[PDB]
């Protein structure tokens, strides 16, 4: 991924960008024999299978090995849909659009215990990115940068091989770096303004880990077996015969 | 903070430095009689006498509502303690400088059930630091972000006073991403390294955030009353009588 210009990374991200998925409860039934968090739940695994695949894409990542691309994503998937949700909500105020059928408001997330403080961040998060006017090149920058960044530090110990994995990624995150200054220049940005809109988009990304790791926390102790890896592991752990 | 130098913060930041505080326990009598939880929990109640005032002496932080102040300390304080330990373990590899007097290793944490995990996180950022020949102007930088940034987002509804707060801590945050980038280009990086650095330290804040989160669940667990806020109020809210 590092031969690749400013330019051609954009365009990488931009292709690569998951899609759209709907909810799934009869929309001819009423809402108050739905379980919301089965409804949320069921949503966020299906879009996993997506953001495995939406991974594969991103410029360096399956350069990585299979062990390596697992752990990076066992640590980044919550922050990943997280940032999704926030994005496809933004021009949604006071609400969250968990799928284009299913626009959540804040009371509306008060029906699950300890869930309206999630919502809470969350729906703050989409005023931000709001209010400083995100743009969708630059948020794929973002989400891109959270796959690669949320494990580096995790790996176990530092085998050689594992040294050259850390100088890998974090060589594809420079690249990244150069390509939203890039976006920030061609959009006219003083050079100014650019660091400064860097350094506000890359503290987002603390507020990000931050509901992700609250919402681990909130998660373990529901409903929402095998772990997370091995789960993880076969999804990209694939054959090549369907070529 | 907004008329200040990118050297006046420095300079303003370098001042109002900390101190190094020591462990409080009989160095003649033997190790396997400390209670080492006591020993962490005692060591870091004294330093946040010393954060609070740390935290008057960063420009722009003595602007806001006495509320504000006690906020983002509350949602900050646990990461402040980190990046000063990662810091100041940042030389003596394999191990943590929780005090000049207490230094100690990964198989010295396994002694508290769920405390080697923590230590592993800090232990590695403290590698990746050293690593990135972390200095200490730009250090100052980083606490001074988190102080600012890490309880932004979370201010409860927003009053015209609120939005102002905001509008105030973003405009400090700028400023210091100014003085990153003058630290940087004083130091002969080329424009390239610049926005890299930048954008690799800011990663860091990412990670710090994370061991903030897990720790502030395995201190909820523990033996580690008044509400965490009320205390801050206390120590914050001071009279100028002293004067
Ligand atoms: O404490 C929290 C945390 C997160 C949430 C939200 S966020 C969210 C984001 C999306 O993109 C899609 C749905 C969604 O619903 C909740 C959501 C519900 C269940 C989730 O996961 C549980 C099941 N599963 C996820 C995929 C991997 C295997 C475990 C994930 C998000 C609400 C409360
Ligand atoms: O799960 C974890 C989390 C953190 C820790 C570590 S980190 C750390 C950093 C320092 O600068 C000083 C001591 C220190 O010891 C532990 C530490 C122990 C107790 C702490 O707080 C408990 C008591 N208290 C803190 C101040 C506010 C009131 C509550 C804070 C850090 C170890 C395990």
């Given amino acids: 991924a590092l031969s690749l210009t400013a330019d051609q990374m954009v365009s ?25 968090m089965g409804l949320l739940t069921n949503l966020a695994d299906r879009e996993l299978v997506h953001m495995i695949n939406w991974a594969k894409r991103v410029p360096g990542f399956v350069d990585l090995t299979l062990h390596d ?28 659009l968990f799928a284009p059928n299913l626009l959540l408001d804040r009371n509306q997330g008060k029906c699950v215990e300890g869930m309206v403080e999630i919502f809470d961040m969350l729906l703050a998060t989409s005023s931000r990115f ?19 960044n949320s494990g580096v530090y995790t790996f176990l110990s530092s085998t050689l091989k594992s040294l050259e994995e850390k100088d890998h990624i974090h060589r594809v995150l420079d690249k990244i770096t150069d390509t939203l ?23 987002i990304l603390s507020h990000i880990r931050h509901m992700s790791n609250k919402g681990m926390e909130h998660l373990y102790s529901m409903k929402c077996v095998v772990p997370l890896y091995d789960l993880l592991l076969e999804m990209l752990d694939a054959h090549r015969l369907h070529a």
Same sequence: chains 1, 2.
């Avoid at 690569?16 to 709907?22: D, F, Q, S």
């Avoid at 066992?74 to 949700?85: Q, R, S, Y």
């Fill in 69 to 96: 691309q697992v752990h990076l994503l066992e640590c980044a998937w919550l922050e990943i849909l997280m940032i999704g949700l926030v994005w496809r909500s933004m021009e949604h105020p006071g609400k969250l």
């Fill in 12 to 36: 990488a991200l931009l292709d690569a960008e998951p899609p759209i998925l709907y909810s799934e409860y009869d929309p001819t039934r009423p809402f108050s024999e739905a379980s919301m």
């Fill in 181 to 203: 200054i890039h976006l920030m220049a061609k959009a006219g940005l003083t050079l100014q303004q650019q660091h400064q809109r860097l350094a506000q988009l890359l503290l």
């Fill in 130 to 148: 709001r209010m400083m006017n995100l743009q969708g090149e630059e948020f794929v920058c973002l989400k891109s940068i959270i796959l690669l």
